[PDB]
Paper text:
Cyclic GMP-dependent protein kinases (PKGs) are key mediators of the nitric oxide/cyclic guanosine monophosphate (cGMP) signaling pathway that regulates biological functions as diverse as smooth muscle contraction, cardiac function, and axon guidance. PKGs belong to the AGC family of protein kinases and have N-terminal regulatory (R) and C-terminal catalytic (C) domains. By analogy to PKA, the PKG R-domain is thought to bind via its AI sequence to the C-domain active site to form an auto-inhibited R:C state; binding of cGMP to the R-domain destabilizes this state and allows active kinase to phosphorylate downstream substrates.
A mutation that causes familial Thoracic Aortic Aneurysms and Dissections (TAAD) maps to this arginine of CNB-A (PKG Iα residue 177), and the mutation to glutamine constitutively activates the enzyme. Mutation R177Q in PKG Iα is associated with TAAD and constitutively activates the holoenzyme despite weakening cGMP affinity for CNB-A more than 105-fold. We also present a high-resolution structure of the CNB-A domain with the TAAD mutation, which reveals a closed cGMP pocket. The similarity of this mutant domain to wildtype cGMP-bound structures and its differences with the open pocket in the AI enzyme explain the constitutive activation of the holoenzyme in TAAD. Since the RQ mutation does not alter folding or prevent adoption of the closed conformation, we propose that the CNB-A sequence is biased to adopt the closed state. Because the PBC of the RQ CNB-A domain makes intermonomer crystal contacts, it is possible that these contacts help stabilize the closed state. Chemical shifts of apo R192Q NH resonances are more similar to those of the cGMP-bound wildtype than to the apo wildtype, consistent with the mutation inducing a similar conformational change as cGMP binding to wildtype. We therefore conclude that the RQ mutation causes constitutive kinase activation by allowing CNB-A to adopt a closed PBC-A similar to that of cGMP-bound wildtype without binding cGMP. The activating effect of the CNB-A RQ mutation reflects destabilization of the auto-inhibited state we describe here.
Residue numbers in the entry: 79 to 202
The structure:
Amino acid sequence: QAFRKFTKSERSKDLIKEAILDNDFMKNLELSQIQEIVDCMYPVEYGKDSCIIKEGDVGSLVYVMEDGKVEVTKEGVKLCTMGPGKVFGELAILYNCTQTATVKTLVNVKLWAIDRQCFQTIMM
């Protein structure tokens, strides 16, 4: 039952909650689960032109964008761009499978990540 609270700003808590409630796979979580996810999220930064996750890789974190923009690609096609308040990486963890798409930064990016063990603890 791995878990750890990371102290963060009120704006960041609101951003994580908005991202959860905006995603069809996550938006029906109980309030207690939403808060546990908020608490277990920790900050990560990736410089511009950096792959966050690559298609075909095993999942390790669930990500919520905080600042900057990422491009999601598959088979060399831009699927979309993702800015603040968007979740990604949850499917690989929820369905214990590899990443369907690559996510690469277009500019310097800040995001919130939750370790798969903590996400698994909360979903249980």
